[PDB]
């Protein structure tokens, strides 16, 4: 129906999703600046569930964008995008839990020392999957 | 013990995930191919092909993917 | 004992599942593909039902060895 | 003794089942597929009955080795 | 002696049965399938009788090695 | 520990990547070739797009195991 | 000596029988199936007699190695 | 450590490259040959371009594992 | 010496016979089956005579290795 | 180290070359033969040129692994 | 030396003969069967003579390795 | 070192030549036979020349590995 | 050294000859049989000459490895 019409919302959705991944990394990095308690156990134990919660939240955000698109319409193109997300989503969740635990173990000051490597590594893996998705979408549109 | 433990454990993730992951990928290719022929041969389920291709694929990968998350969750984590 | 025990046990679920799961995957590919050839022309009503029974019968050949490998593995967990 | 015992015993149910179960899976795929080719044209009344007898005869070739591997395995359980 | 004894003995029933049982399964699949091809067109009266004789002759090729593996195995049981 | 550790870890990325990467290569060859046969006659517009999705899906099956083997490997680098 | 003796001896009847018995089973499947193809059209009077001679000649190829494996095995029994 | 290190490392580039390079060679032979069959009749303009993309995609599957084996190998060189 | 002697000697008659006997069985199945195909139509007078010469030539390929394995084996008996 | 070093290194050029060279030979036989079948009817002008490109591409798959095996080997020569 | 000597020597005549004798048996079955197919229609005068030359050329491929295995074996006899 | 050296070196020329020489022989049989099929009807002028180029290209695939195995072997001779 | 020497050397002529001789036998069977198929119809004048060149080229592929195995073997004789 509309060229620039459909393009504006679709473009917005892709940008937000990439931002969302960055946002997940941002929440933990932001948290370290301000410390309070650290008994080794509770701290690390609390973090593992928190990471799981963040991944679930990202999935929810994607669902919200799709529902909005349907509402605007009146008063596959979507199937492929979903598939890419699933592959990346599975890898990111595994990476976040495994990377965080490993980072803490190698050093002594799991606090800041664990956070710098754990945060950077998780973001890189998710980005790589996302990059693959971007190339596929561009090729389709010609 | 601890030696063959950590070694067997890791190797487990690799043998398990690579073996089940491979089994997964292959099947998607196997069943996906055959399925496609059928689901596509049908009247107008061509779109069904892809729509279910993504779901059938992810569900096949979800296995080792689950073993990885669940595995490392108590493996690499709890050690 | 306890050494070769947990060593053989784990290696069991990997040798077992990897070996039965692969036997499953292949079959699904063998029985699934070959079966279709012997009923691809006919409608996708009757053979489609029988076809699944096969490809699935193969998709269920791994599920057991796994549950078995998982069991023997879960056994070690009991210590 | 007790060492190579529980080691050989377990490895038995894995070598046994994995080896007979796979021999079963394949057959079901061999006999099952080949059989169909030699009776795919004819009605699915008589051959369908004979076909199952085969694919099943193969689906029952693993069940024994397993029950056997499970037995020898359950034996170790007795200690 | 006693070590490699119970080790070789058990490994015997696994190497024996797994090896003869598999030789059996395959045959049943080879002789069974190939035989049908050479008598699939004809009625299922005469060949059906001869066909079983084969597939069974193969289904009985494992039964012996097993009874033999079971024997040698049961021997160890005597100690 | 540390011995079988770096030994199993490295062997992991070789057993992992070599095993998943090969599973990838083959698939790309299996899915890629087989897929073409089921859409070689039709134009190279639609199938060409779906064809890549497959051969690539296979070309991406190794990329992960590798990144994973590289990771576990890079982990050892951390010491 | 006595160690590798009873070890090699037993392994003999397993390596021997398993190896000759399997060679037997296969043949019966090879000679039996192939033979039928070269005399399936003709009556089941003459070829049926020659056919058995083959499938049996193969069913008798294992019987010897076994009797031989049993012998060498029974020898160990003499000590 | 240092022992199994340089031992596993080297064996890595041999197990890695030999395993991925072979997976590459085969594919080039699988994808390359199979692809041609699904586009041999048509002109050598379009398929010739797509054909190379495949055979090459396979000729590039070894190049990486090698560069990787060479890297891990060159790493040992650093000591 | 005496150890690897009786060990290699026995293993010889098993490796020898099992290896030549199997080579015999197969041939009888290969030469026997293939030969028939190249003379199944013609009368069973001339080819039947030549056919036996083959299947037998194969049935005599094991008999020697065996007599040889039996000899080397009987040699050990001399001590 | 130095022990498993020169041991793994040499074994590398044998495992490497033998493994890549064989992968090369086969391909040349796979790609070379299969390619011809998909362009044997057409003139020997265009396909003859493309045919060489393949059989050669395979004849050049060993040349590298060898130069590589020779290198790693020549490295040991440096000591 | 003397240990691995008589061990390798004997294993030689078993590995040698079993390996060349089998290569002989197969050939006789390969060359013998295949040859007949390429001259089964024609009279049994010329091809019968050439046919023997082959099947025999194969029946003489084992005779040498054996005489060789027997020699190396007879050498050990000299001590 | 010197031990595994001359051990690996020799085993190299056997593993190398035996592995490349066999890869050569087969190819000559693969490329040689397959090539003929794709140019057997045409005159024996052009294909006869190209045919040799292949069978020979394969007859020259062993010659190198051998010269290489001979070299590495001759190297040991230098001590 | 001297131990693995005479051990590897002998094993060389067995691994070498058995491996190249078998590669020879097979080829003679592969090239010999396949070649005939691509020139069985034509007179036995020209192809009969070319046919021998092949089957012989294969009958000469073992002769070298043997002379080589015999040499390396005769070398040990020099001590």
Q: How far apart are CA M45 and CA M42, in angstroms?
A: 8
Token pair belonging to F60:
């991406």
Q: How far apart are CA G68 and CA G70, in angstroms?
A: 5
Contacts of residue L37, Cβ cutoff 8 Å, sequence gap at least 6: M34, M37, M38
The answer to whether L50 and J49 have CB atoms below 8 angstroms apart is no
Give the ranges where K1-79 is alpha helix by DSSP (H).
2-37, 46-59, 62-78
Q: Give the length of chain C.
A: 79
Positive/negative CA dihedral, C59, C61, C64, C69: negative
Q: What residues of chain B have any CB closer than 8 angstroms to a CB in chain F?
A: 2-4, 6-7, 10-11, 13-15, 17-19, 21-22, 25-26, 28-29, 32-33, 36-37, 50, 57
Give the ranges where chain F is alpha helix by DSSP (H).
2-37, 46-59, 62-78
Number of domains comprising chain H: 1
Which residue, D20, G76, D16, is CA-closest to E12? D16
**Fold of the A1-142 domain:** 1.20.120
Which residue, C13, M2, F72, J74, is CA-closest to D13? C13
The answer to whether H20 and J22 have CB atoms below 8 angstroms apart is no
Q: Classify residue A12 by burial, with Cβ atoms within 10 Å: 0-12, 13-18, 19+.
A: exposed
For tokens 């190939």, the residue is E34
Inter-CA distances, J55 with B8, H29, J52, J66, L66, Å: 43, 10, 5, 17, 21
Inter-CA distances, C58 with B3, B29, C67, J16, K13, Å: 37, 15, 15, 37, 45
M46: distance to nearest CA of chain K, Å? 15
Helix, strand, coil content of chain J in percent (nearest 5): 85, 0, 15
Contacts F64 to A, Cβ<8 Å: 91
Q: How far apart are CA J25 and CA J56, in angstroms?
A: 10
For tokens 């007859």, the residue is L59
Please give the angle made by the CA atoms of A15, A16 and A20, to the nearest 5 degrees: 120
Dmax (CA) for chain L in angstroms is: 58
Q: Give the length of chain G.
A: 79
Q: How far apart are CA G65 and CA G67, in angstroms?
A: 6
The answer to whether K12 and K72 have CB atoms below 8 angstroms apart is yes
Range of the domain at J57: 1-79
Q: How far apart are CA G5 and CA G10, in angstroms?
A: 8
The answer to whether L61 and L16 have CB atoms below 8 angstroms apart is no
The answer to whether L7 and L34 have CB atoms below 8 angstroms apart is no
What is residue G60's DSSP assignment? Answer: T
What is residue B77's DSSP assignment? Answer: I
The answer to whether L21 and L64 have CB atoms below 8 angstroms apart is no
Q: How far apart are CA B2 and CA J59, in angstroms?
A: 48
G56 C-beta neighbours (distance < 10 Å), count: 14
Q: How far apart are CA L18 and CA J22, in angstroms?
A: 11
Which residue, E61, B76, C5, B68, is CA-closest to D20? E61
Q: How far apart are CA B21 and CA K67, in angstroms?
A: 52
| DSSP string covering chain D | -HHHHHHHHHHHHHHHHHHHHHHHHHHHHHHHHHHHHTSSSS-SSHHHHHHHHHHHHHHTTHHHHHHHHHHHHHHHHH-
Token pair belonging to F6:
């770096």
Contacts of residue F26, Cβ cutoff 8 Å, sequence gap at least 6: F58, H23, H26, H27, H30
Q: How far apart are CA L45 and CA L52, in angstroms?
A: 11
Q: How far apart are CA C57 and CA C65, in angstroms?
A: 13
Instruction: Write out the H or E segment, with its range, that includes residue C10.
Output: helix C2-37
Contact assignment for H44 to J61 by CB distance below 8 Å: no
The span from the first CA to the last CA of chain H, in angstroms, equals 13
I10: distance to nearest CA of chain K, Å? 10
Active-site annotation holds for I7: no
Q: Give φ, ψ of F17 to 5 degrees.
A: -65, -50
Contact assignment for B65 to A76 by CB distance below 8 Å: no
Q: How far apart are CA D51 and CA D54, in angstroms?
A: 5
The answer to whether F75 and F49 have CB atoms below 8 angstroms apart is no
Instruction: Give the one of D10, D33, D66 whose C-beta lies nearest to C12's C-beta.
Output: D10
Token pair belonging to K17:
């003969």
Token pair belonging to C63:
């599920």
Inter-CA distances, M53 with K47, L64, M56, Å: 18, 22, 5
CATH code for the domain of E27:
1.20.20.10
Q: Packing angle between helix J46-59 and helix J2-37, nearest 10 degrees?
A: 160
The answer to whether K33 and I30 have CB atoms below 8 angstroms apart is yes
Positive/negative CA dihedral, M24, M29, M31, M36: positive
Inter-CA distances, A43 with A32, H58, J9, Å: 11, 48, 48
Taking CA atoms, what residue in E is nearest to D9? E10
The alpha carbon torsion through C27, C31, C33, C34 (nearest 10 deg) reads: 130
The answer to whether J61 and J25 have CB atoms below 8 angstroms apart is no
Q: Classify residue A14 by burial, with Cβ atoms within 10 Å: 0-12, 13-18, 19+.
A: middle
Contacts of residue D70, Cβ cutoff 8 Å, sequence gap at least 6: D13, D17
The answer to whether E22 and E74 have CB atoms below 8 angstroms apart is no
Positive/negative CA dihedral, G13, G15, G18, G24: negative
| DSSP string covering chain B | -HHHHHHHHHHHHHHHHHHHHHHHHHHHHHHHHHHHHHHHHSSS-HHHHHHHHHHHHHHHHHHHHHHHHHHHIIIIIT-
The C-alpha R_g of chain G, in whole angstroms, comes to 17
CB pairs under 8 A between I and K: 105
Chains A and B touching, counted as 3 or more CB pairs less than 8 Å apart: yes
The C-alpha R_g of chain D, in whole angstroms, comes to 17
The set of catalytic residues of C is 61
């Amino acid at each position: 129906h509309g060229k620039s019409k459909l393009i504006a919302p679709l473009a917005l959705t892709i940008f937000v999703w990439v931002f969302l991944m960055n946002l997940m990394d941002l929440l933990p990095i932001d948290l370290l600046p301000y410390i309070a308690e650290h008994v080794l156990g509770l701290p690390a134990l609390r973090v593992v569930p928190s990471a799981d919660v963040n991944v679930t939240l990202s999935m929810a955000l994607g669902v919200f964008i799709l529902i909005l698109f349907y509402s605007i319409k009146m008063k596959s193109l979507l199937s492929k995008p979903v598939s890419l997300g699933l592959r990346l989503f599975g890898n990111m969740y595994a990476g976040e839990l495994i990377f965080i635990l490993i980072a803490g173990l190698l050093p002594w000051w799991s606090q800041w020392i664990l956070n710098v490597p754990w945060a950077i590594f998780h973001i890189l893996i998710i980005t790589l999957q996302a990059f693959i998705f971007m190339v596929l979408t561009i090729v389709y549109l010609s | 013990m601890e030696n063959l433990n950590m070694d067997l454990l890791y190797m487990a993730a690799a043998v398990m995930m690579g073996l089940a992951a491979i089994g997964a990928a292959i099947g998607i290719g196997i069943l996906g191919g055959k399925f496609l022929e059928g689901a596509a041969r049908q009247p107008d389920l061509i779109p069904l092909l892809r729509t279910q291709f993504f779901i059938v694929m992810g569900l096949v990968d979800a296995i080792p993917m689950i073993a990885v998350g669940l595995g490392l969750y108590v493996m690499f984590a709890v050690a």
